[PDB]
Curated annotation (Swiss-Prot), chain C:
<keyword id="KW-0633">Potassium transport</keyword>
<dbReference type="GO" id="GO:0044325">
    <property type="term" value="F:transmembrane transporter binding"/>
</dbReference>
<dbReference type="GO" id="GO:0033574">
    <property type="term" value="P:response to testosterone"/>
</dbReference>
<keyword id="KW-0597">Phosphoprotein</keyword>
<dbReference type="GO" id="GO:0005886">
    <property type="term" value="C:plasma membrane"/>
</dbReference>
<dbReference type="GO" id="GO:0005249">
    <property type="term" value="F:voltage-gated potassium channel activity"/>
</dbReference>
<feature type="short sequence motif" description="Selectivity filter">
    <location>
        <begin position="130"/>
        <end position="135"/>
    </location>
</feature>
<feature type="topological domain" description="Extracellular">
    <location>
        <begin position="132"/>
        <end position="142"/>
    </location>
</feature>
<dbReference type="GO" id="GO:0050877">
    <property type="term" value="P:nervous system process"/>
</dbReference>
Curated annotation (Swiss-Prot), chain E:
<comment type="subunit">
    <text>Forms an heterooctamer with KCNJ11; four ABCC8/SUR1 molecules interact with one KCNJ11 homotetramer.</text>
</comment>
<feature type="binding site">
    <location>
        <position position="100"/>
    </location>
    <ligand>
        <name>ADP</name>
    </ligand>
</feature>
<feature type="binding site">
    <location>
        <position position="98"/>
    </location>
    <ligand>
        <name>ADP</name>
    </ligand>
</feature>
<feature type="binding site">
    <location>
        <position position="99"/>
    </location>
    <ligand>
        <name>ADP</name>
    </ligand>
</feature>
<feature type="domain" description="ABC transporter 2">
    <location>
        <begin position="59"/>
        <end position="292"/>
    </location>
</feature>
<comment type="function">
    <text>Regulator subunit of pancreatic ATP-sensitive potassium channel (KATP), playing a major role in the regulation of insulin release. In pancreatic cells, it forms KATP channels with KCNJ11; KCNJ11 forms the channel pore while ABCC8 is required for activation and regulation.</text>
</comment>
<feature type="transmembrane region" description="Helical; Name=17">
    <location>
        <begin position="1"/>
        <end position="11"/>
    </location>
</feature>
<feature type="binding site">
    <location>
        <position position="96"/>
    </location>
    <ligand>
        <name>ADP</name>
    </ligand>
</feature>
<feature type="binding site">
    <location>
        <position position="101"/>
    </location>
    <ligand>
        <name>ADP</name>
    </ligand>
</feature>
């Protein structure tokens, strides 16, 4: 009855966006590890909008 | 009242499933009884009161 | 506020392995869909239609299509909206000239007897419906009134013309006549002239003859090719075994329509067990031909599913002869008296007949 | 994704067992999701309460400030009650899991518990277990009752204190209805967020904990990274820097070469297979893995990995169906006598949370899934210890040789089965972490030290 | 009040939905609590009329035919095999026809079958299920263990420790549990009994049987047991027939089944080949071949 969810909510695209945030913050900045601060700022940067 | 329901229903269910034929259990899915003994007992003992 | 769904975010994994309710099993028993229903009304639901404006541009197709109560709503509301809009304009213009102010002076009003919006609306009635009550005259005073009178007259004539056209094309409809053609609820298979054929019966009720009648006949079944080309609805045409070679039919009495099952016919591998309740198979019978009076071409769609096909029965002879003229007893229309016949397939029957004939000769 | 790229050292898998990771993926993600649900509350409800209090003063005066102060003073107390409630809830959860495991153990063996007339023993045990769980439930029920009491009885107390103070301690206004009823409406629209800002803070603490747990999980050593297996040194380790597993290993195996191996009591049999597999940190070695960049290495181990599904799904392993290879594999393992009495044969709920099986039956399952895929290499591992059916052993060996060696399907059988202890191909004998030579069997008989 | 009518309606509907789901849980609970065991019953005065504990242990099969559904088919049909009191009679005929049925018929697993049986000169259908299994011993076909006191694992009711259990241990070969396990008898089972043996099942069964003061001993086949475990088990069966003066067994492997004092063949619910002397069993090649 319910069906495949729209493009924006598909887990593949959400994972792609979160990887983009992680890569962008780990590359433009110089922080090889991914600590609590890094993950927290990553979620905010990818879902603030 | 929720506490009283939890205690008495649990002990009654234990007693009845004890005095039960094992031919039924060989027919019973053997997980259906486990479900309705863990999940449902949890619901009536932790959510029906509130 | 007052719910406890957010207090506990934890979970327990002790309870699992819950399945086999057997409730959905009964749901799968629901009957499959028919292509075209018995009383026409094809049961196909188009999906992802990109409208692109092709469902408003052909307005005058829609107006004829709509039902009579909806058509009368459009009728009434077209006229009343026109009347009221032009009444507004008459009110405003006769107010601008001052003719609405009571006892203004001896200035000749540009439309007499305008003493309200109520009289303005009545004046719009008189003008557009072309009734012309003498109370509300159009004087020669202001040019804008004469212009608006011309415009309202032309618009009223155009609206009358449009509604006349739609009423013309609606009073000559066909779907009030397509339903007065009668088929059997179920069709039969039986041997005629030693060859297996798929009979059927169709009749007419109204005395009005149906001219240039035409009976197409198709089989609807999912079917694959040797190349793997899978067609979900691979319609196949079927000749009507009519002696002349055309498919036309002269329909007065209830006639027996059938297709002789030769090697070409796609029903060449049917068995009495091969047409059971849930078998995927469906016959369509398109009965075309115009109505004699209005000269409007019509169709009479109908279908026959597998669970309606019945083996080895013959239609009861319906026509009798009264004292002076023939008799048609439509109560025996769809009655199919039992008749024994070989229960093998069409291919097995053909091969057996050929072998027996070769051995005999 | 970081489950995939993760390494399987005993420093990782010996601490965060499958229970830990399942608890993480479910509980931690759930509570992080809940924090993202409630995030706007911790921003708004400050403004909500502040604006409500300020214009409550404007509507009525100081007395409204006093009532709001009473609610705010009782907020930390209600937080304490709710936190103690959560502690009791975790205690009850632990006791409930204990009782559920006890009842799983009990109800499993109902056959011998009823035949031997032994209902009394475990009935008493469960009775005592439920006694302790009932004490915990009493504490939980008492604490949640206090929460309900405070939740539904602070607004009345706030209203009571406000109006009585206004009348007596203030005696300022006549309290016309325009002020009284406005204030009561404000009390509703303030009690709803005031009583819940505490819970938002609670979820904030929990979310910080969840990100701690997730970050720790994300801060473990994970990524280790012609002739099929061409090795020079082969010295790999388990620990990413040190703790070597082996040294001085070298093979060069052409296709179809059933290069069986030997070993000792847990001495470099599966460890050799794993170091080859690529899941060990290779320190002193150089391998150029290439195909006739890797290949779909069929594999297994001592404890078979299974899918909690039906047996058909657990054997096919996400691939098409072909009856010839299917029948050949299920006969060379003799899968039909094994699944004779399972309630629907293939359709049975094999795996955990369901059908419990024996070592030999699970061993047939693993070997079938490994062989069936129709691939170029196969690394079986010890399928003949728990499954020691001699007739099945001969059948499995005949199938192994004829099928695997013909289609070039290398079957590296590293085990200790005597009936073909001398393999039909290349052999290599390992002991105490040293393996002499990987060549033919003629030089192995030439050495003549490991005589049966 | 009109301001609050809104969320009152909302939460009333929502909490109604949650109450509906949890009441479905209660409905399933009562589905379990609507199963009634027919077999458990009492029809006789047990204060003095029955014997305190059966001693003779007479056995007879008065054509006992067992049908659980009582409509499809039975498992035994007109079986009449006389077990000699003091001499074991264990026959591996049609495996899924006679041995499971007989064990189920003695011990109330099948307490509803056409025809009856005299247990120690007394009909068994006039006694409670727990009484019917009170003074009788049996083993299983598969192993099952869990955490719990070994003393209560063997004798939960009687609880005669060290006098019998150590003697029960003596027949067993569990040397390690005495010292390798943490405490042994006073200690509970560890890791759910996944660290001791596949012979722990047989050892516990023998310990319970000797601690039941077995008026009758029943056995079963083996799933995967050590050869030393089989030798000790069979030897202790002989010694239990020596002291407790009763033994009866069953098996499925042809050669192991032949390692018995008596044997027969029972197929298709009825009797196939019965000879009182065991020599005729060897004389019949076809019947012996039937098993394997
Ligand atoms: C490459 C060349 C392309 C073409 C280039 C042409 C260049 C021309 C230059 C511009 C002139 C165009 C003037 C049009 C302005 C009005 C358009 C309009 O109302 O009709 C819009 C639509 C459809 O028509 P279209 O899409 O324009 O078609 C023309 C084109 N060739 C095409 O077919 O795409 O029409 C409808 O969809 C009408 C629906 C009819 C429904 C009946 C009720 C009418 C409502 C109004 C009256 C209601 C009754 C009340 C009376 C009140 C009295 C005031
Ligand atoms: C519950 C919601 C469901 C929504 C689904 C769709 C809604 C459909 C509504 C169906 C029920 C309507 C009841 C209307 C009662 C009067 C009907 C009436 O006069 O028509 C009589 C006949 C036609 O018969 P029909 O049953 O309408 O046939 C329609 C059919 N479906 C078809 O397509 O064939 O008509 C003719 O064959 C024409 C003869 C006309 C002769 C005289 C003219 C009378 C009307 C003139 C206009 C008066 C307007 C007054 C407006 C005043 C405003 C102040
Ligand atoms: C079935 C139907 C006929 C109904 C006719 C309209 C009745 C409204 C009554 C009314 O007050 O009308 C008013 C118009 O009022 C407007 O101008 C309203 C405009 C309404 C447009 C349509 C809305 C639907 C009338 O106002 P008036 O014409 O300015 O009155 C003249 C004043 N004098 C008479 C004192 C000189
Ligand atoms: C599945 C949960 O997804 C939701 C998520 C929300 C957002 C939300 O603030 N929730 C918590 C609040 C915090 C303080 C726990 C809550 C839970 C239970 C009852 C009421 C409330 N408060 C809701 C806001 C107004 C005051 C009372 C709403 C509704 C839903 C929903 O079921 O659709
Ligand atoms: N969903 C749709 N509903 C109605 N017409 C459609 C739909 N999709 C396509 N068509 C029509 O089918 C024809 C060919 O469509 P097709 O899908 O083959 O190509 P297309 O890329 O959509 O074409 P175009 O650029 O001409 O619209 C066109 O006339 C197009 O308008
Ligand atoms: N005499 C008739 N008048 C009108 N419609 C008829 C008549 N005979 C058949 N039909 C039509 O044929 C279809 C069959 O329906 P119905 O079940 O009433 O008839 P039947 O089973 O063919 O039997 P019979 O011919 O005895 O009426 C319907 O669409 C029905 O309207
Ligand atoms: N799961 C494991 N992860 C990491 N290292 C391991 C693991 N299991 C064993 N080891 C290490 O590898 C060494 C060699 O183990 P090996 O691969 O020979 O065992 P095995 O094949 O499972 O043994 P066996 O089949 O005789 O029980 C062990 O002594 C231990 O130090």
């Amino acid at each position: 009855a319910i069906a495949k969810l729209p493009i924006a909510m598909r887990a593949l695209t959400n994972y792609q966006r979160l990887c983009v945030a992680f890569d962008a913050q780990a590359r433009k900045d110089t922080q090889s590890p991914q600590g609590a601060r890094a993950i927290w700022r990553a979620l905010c940067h990818a879902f603030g909008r | 009242t929720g506490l009283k329901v939890a205690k008495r229903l649990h002990r009654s269910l234990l007693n009845r499933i004890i005095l039960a034929p094992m031919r039924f259990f060989e027919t019973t899915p053997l997980g259906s009884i486990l479900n309705r003994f863990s999940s449902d007992c949890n619901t009536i003992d932790q959510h029906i009161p509130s | 506020m007052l719910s406890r769904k957010g207090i506990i975010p934890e979970e327990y994994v002790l309870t699992r392995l819950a399945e086999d309710p057997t409730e959905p099993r009964y749901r799968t028993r629901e009957r499959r869909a028919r292509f075209v229903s018995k009383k026409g009304n094809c049961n196909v639901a188009h999906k992802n239609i990109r409208e692109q404006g092709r469902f408003l541009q052909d307005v005058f197709t829609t107006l004829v299509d709509l039902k009579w109560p909806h058509t009368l709503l459009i009728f009434t509301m077209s006229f009343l909206c026109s009347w009221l809009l032009f009444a507004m304009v008459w009110w405003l213009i006769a107010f601008a000239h001052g003719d609405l102010a009571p006892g203004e002076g001896t200035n000749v009003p540009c439309v007499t007897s305008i003493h309200s919006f109520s009289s303005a609306f009545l004046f719009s009635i008189e003008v557009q419906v072309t009734i012309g009550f003498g109370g509300r005259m159009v004087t020669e005073e202001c040019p804008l009134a004469i212009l608006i009178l011309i415009v309202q007259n032309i618009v009223g004539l155009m609206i009358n013309a449009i509604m006349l056209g739609c009423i013309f094309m609606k009073t000559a409809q066909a779907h009030r006549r397509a339903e007065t053609l009668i088929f059997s609820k179920h069709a039969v298979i039986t041997l005629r002239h030693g060859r297996l054929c798929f009979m059927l019966r169709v009749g007419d009720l109204r005395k009005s003859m149906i001219i240039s009648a035409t009976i197409h006949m198709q089989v609807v079944r999912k079917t694959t090719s040797p190349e793997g080309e899978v067609v979900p609805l691979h319609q196949v045409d079927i000749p009507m075994e009519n002696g002349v070679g055309g498919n036309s039919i002269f329909l007065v009495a209830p006639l027996i329509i059938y297709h002789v099952i030769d090697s070409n016919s796609p029903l060449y591998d049917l068995a009495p067990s091969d047409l059971h309740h849930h078998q995927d198979l469906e016959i369509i019978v398109i009965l075309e031909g115009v109505v004699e009076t209005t000269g409007i071409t019509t169709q009479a769609r109908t279908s026959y599913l597998a669970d309606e096909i019945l083996w080895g029965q013959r239609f009861v002879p319906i026509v009798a002869e009264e004292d002076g003229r023939y008799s048609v007893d439509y109560s025996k229309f769809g009655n199919t008296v039992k008749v024994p016949t070989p229960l093998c397939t069409a291919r097995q029957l053909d091969e057996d007949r050929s072998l027996l004939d070769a051995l005999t000769l | 994704n970081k489950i995939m790229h993760m390494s399987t050292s005993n420093l990782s898998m010996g601490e965060m067992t499958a229970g830990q990771i399942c608890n993480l993926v479910a509980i931690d993600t759930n509570q992080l999701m809940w924090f993202f649900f409630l995030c706007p509350n911790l921003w708004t409800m400050p403004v909500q309460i502040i604006v409500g209090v300020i214009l409550l003063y404007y509507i009525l005066g100081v007395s409204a400030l006093i009532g709001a102060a009473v609610i705010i003073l009782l907020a930390p107390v209600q937080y304490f009650v709710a936190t103690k409630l959560s502690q009791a809830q975790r205690t009850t959860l632990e006791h409930s899991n204990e009782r559920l495991k006890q009842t799983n153990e009990m109800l499993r063996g109902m056959k011998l518990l009823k035949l031997y007339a032994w209902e009394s023993i475990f009935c008493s045990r469960v009775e005592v277990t439920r006694r302790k769980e009932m004490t915990s439930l009493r504490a939980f029920a008492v604490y949640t009752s206090i929460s309900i009491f405070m939740n539904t009885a602070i607004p009345i107390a706030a209203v009571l204190i406000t109006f009585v103070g206004h009348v007596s301690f203030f005696k300022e206004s006549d309290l016309s209805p325009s002020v009284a009823f406005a204030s009561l409406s404000l009390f509703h629209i303030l009690v709803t967020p005031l009583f819940l800002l505490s819970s938002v803070v609670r979820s904030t603490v929990k979310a910080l904990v969840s990100v701690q747990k997730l970050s720790e999980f994300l801060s473990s050593a994970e990524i280790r990274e012609n002739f099929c297996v061409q090795i020079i040194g082969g010295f790999f380790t388990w620990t990413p820097d040190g703790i070597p597993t082996l040294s001085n290993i070298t093979i060069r195996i052409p296709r179809g070469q059933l290069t069986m191996i030997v070993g000792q009591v847990g001495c470099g049999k599966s460890s050799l297979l794993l170091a080859t597999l690529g899941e060990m940190q290779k320190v002193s070695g150089a391998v150029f893995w290439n195909s006739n960049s890797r290949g779909p290495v069929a594999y297994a181990s001592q404890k078979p990995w299974l899918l909690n599904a039906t047996v058909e799904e657990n054997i096919t392993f996400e691939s098409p169906f072909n009856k010839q290879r299917y029948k050949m594999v299920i006969e060379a393992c003799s899968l039909q006598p094994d699944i004779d009495i399972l309630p629907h044969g293939d359709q049975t709920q094999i795996g955990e949370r369901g059908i419990n099986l024996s070592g030999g039956q699970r061993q047939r399952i693993s070997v079938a899934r490994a062989l069936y895929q129709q691939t170029n290499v196969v690394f079986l591992d010890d399928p003949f210890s728990a499954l020691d059916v001699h007739l099945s052993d001969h059948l499995m060996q005949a199938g192994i040789l004829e099928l695997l060696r013909d289609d070039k399907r290398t079957v590296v059988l590293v085990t200790h089965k005597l009936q073909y202890l001398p393999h039909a191909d290349w052999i290599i004998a390992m002991k105490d972490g040293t393996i002499q030579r990987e060549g033919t069997l003629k030089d192995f008989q030439r050495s003549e030290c490991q005589l049966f | 009040y009109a301001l609050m009518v809104s969320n009152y309606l909302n939460w009333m509907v929502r909490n109604l939905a949650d109450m509906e789901i949890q009441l479905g849980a209660v409905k399933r609970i009562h589905a379990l609590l609507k199963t009634e065991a027919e077999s458990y019953e009492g029809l006789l005065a047990p204060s003095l009329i029955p014997k305190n504990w059966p001693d003779q242990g007479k056995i007879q099969i008065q054509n006992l035919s067992v049908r659980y559904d009582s409509s499809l088919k039975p498992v035994l049909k007109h079986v009449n095999t006389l077990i000699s009191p003091g001499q074991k009679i264990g026959i591996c005929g049609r495996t899924g026809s006679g041995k499971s049925s007989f064990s189920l018929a003695f011990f109330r697993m099948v307490d509803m079958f056409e025809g009856r049986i005299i247990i120690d000169g007394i009909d068994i259908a006039k006694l409670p299920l727990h009484t019917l299994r009170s003074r009788l011993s049996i083993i299983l076909q598969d192993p099952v263990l869990f955490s719990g006191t070994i003393r209560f694992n063997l004798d939960p009711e009687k609880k005669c420790s060290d006098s019998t259990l150590w003697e029960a241990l003596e027949i067993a070969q569990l040397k390690l549990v005495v010292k390798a396990l943490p405490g042994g008898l006073d200690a509970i089972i560890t890791e759910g009994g996944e660290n001791f043996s596949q012979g722990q099942r047989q050892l516990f069964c023998l310990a319970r049987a000797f601690v039941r003061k077995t008026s009758i001993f029943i056995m079963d086949e083996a799933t995967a047991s050590i050869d030393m475990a089989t030798e000790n088990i069979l030897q202790k069966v002989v010694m239990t027939a020596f002291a407790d003066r009763t033994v009866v067994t069953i098996a499925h492997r042809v050669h192991t089944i032949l390692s018995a004092d008596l044997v027969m063949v029972l197929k298709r619910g009825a009797i196939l080949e019965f000879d009182k002397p065991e020599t005729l069993l060897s004389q019949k090649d076809s019947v012996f071949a039937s098993f394997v």
